[PDB]
């Protein structure tokens, strides 16, 4: 997204990379980073299942 400012009146965010859509993932291993990557977007990817979403079907656990 090119043209979004997301400012506040006399208020700011101490951590940089805020207001814009920037998201930073941090971790000391792939299983720590991958868990954050998958967990960020998986629950909001909604569908019309009568029963749940991809998280219930896909375990994505036991990573190392």
């Amino acid at each position: 997204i090119q043209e979004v400012q997301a400012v506040l009146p006399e208020v700011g965010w101490l951590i940089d990379g805020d207001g814009d859509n920037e998201v930073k993932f941090t971790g000391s291993s792939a299983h720590e980073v991958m868990t954050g990557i998958i967990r960020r977007f998986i629950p909001y990817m909604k569908y019309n299942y009568t029963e749940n979403t991809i998280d219930n079907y896909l375990d994505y656990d036991d990573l190392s």
Binding site: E10, V11, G12, L14, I15, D16, G17, T26, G27, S28
Partner: protein, 348 residues
């Protein structure tokens, strides 16, 4: 139902088998019948042992189910951190909850996150905020000065450090701890009692140390976490949750804590004249620090208890221990708590 060793069961079975005939009395180790009987007796002994263990577990489960006093699960580690700015702040910035904190040290890769938002006042230079460890257990008890970076942009932050260690991180409660808690709960059914107020204040899982001081017309409660620093939110939660055990006709207050300081000097005569270097002295000092910091307000420093704690090392190594300064037991005031200050340890 009683425990019986393998040999007695085997002897009884062999004696029973010998009745009615005399073509069997040969039980050398090479005999296969002896091997089969040994296996059967071993299985029976294991069945008895497992039955006793399962009976104990069932008693524990029934105690859990009857009074709904479930065991405490793994407790999150948390503390405080200091945020340092390059220059004094000009505008009121915002710090949303969930901001991550990570230690650059490879030995402690565990992460931390916030739960409650914080606002930095204008013309400020530093601010203290609480951080809660995602992982629960022994990994949360990092040493001092372990958290170095915020793991984000950190445009207005130079460095982050913690002045105090993390001690709230603990594993699951043992059977003895649950038994003591249940005994306190059973003795706490009668409200308007000091032993009842003990359980009433201890019902919150975060609280570890707690003490109650009484006078003619006022009740005061002293409590703290393992780190030894009371919080306003903890006081509010205690007030909210303790309404079912407070005395009706007497006022109650929950405040007061002070870190009492004492310097411990001890002389240790190792049995082995060799290997008297400073590494073992550092290890002993760390053990003493861990022991003293584990004490609570209710507990008081005792010479014999300290001797038992330090002498947990095998007696063959350490042959004698004595204190140059400590000669009499020290009584902690009810509000204060005894803990390690600056410890000096030397051979002689």
């Amino acid at each position: 139902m009683k425990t019986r060793k393998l040999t007695n069961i085997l002897s009884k079975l062999i004696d029973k088998t010998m009745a009615g005939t005399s073509k069997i009395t040969d039980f050398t180790p090479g005999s296969a019948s002896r091997s089969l009987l040994e296996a059967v007796s071993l299985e029976i002994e294991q069945f008895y042992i497992l039955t006793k263990e399962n009976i104990d577990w069932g008693i524990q489960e029934g105690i859990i189910e009857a009074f709904d006093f479930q065991k405490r699960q793994s407790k999150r580690a948390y503390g405080d951190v200091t945020i340092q700015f390059y220059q004094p702040l000009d505008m009121r910035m915002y710090i949303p909850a969930g901001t991550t904190f990570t230690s650059t040290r490879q030995e402690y890769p565990q992460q931390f996150e916030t739960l409650v938002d914080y606002y930095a006042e204008p013309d400020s230079t530093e601010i203290v905020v609480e951080v809660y460890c995602k992982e629960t257990g022994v990994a949360g008890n990092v040493p001092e000065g372990t958290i170095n970076t915020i793991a984000s942009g950190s445009s207005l932050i130079r460095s982050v450090n913690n002045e105090y260690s993390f001690n709230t991180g603990t594993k699951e409660e043992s059977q003895e701890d649950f038994k003591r808690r249940f005994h306190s709960f059973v003795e706490s059914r009668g409200r308007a009692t000091n032993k009842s107020v003990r359980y009433g204040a201890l019902q919150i899982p975060d609280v570890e140390g707690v003490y109650v001081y009484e006078e003619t017309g006022h009740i005061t409660v002293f409590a703290h976490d393992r780190n030894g620093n009371l919080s306003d939110t903890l006081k509010e939660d205690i007030i909210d949750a303790l309404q079912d055990y407070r005395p009706s006709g007497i006022m109650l207050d929950v405040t007061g804590v002070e870190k009492e300081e004492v310097n411990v000097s001890a002389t240790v005569t190792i049995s082995n004249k060799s290997r008297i270097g400073d590494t073992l002295q550092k290890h002993i000092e760390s053990v003493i620090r861990s022991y003293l910091n584990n004490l609570k307000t209710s507990d008081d420093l005792i010479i014999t208890d300290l001797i038992q704690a330090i002498m947990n090392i095998d007696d063959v190594l350490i042959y004698d221990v004595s204190f140059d300064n400590l000669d009499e037991n020290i009584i902690v005031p009810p509000q204060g708590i005894i803990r390690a200050g600056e410890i000096k340890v030397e051979l002689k």
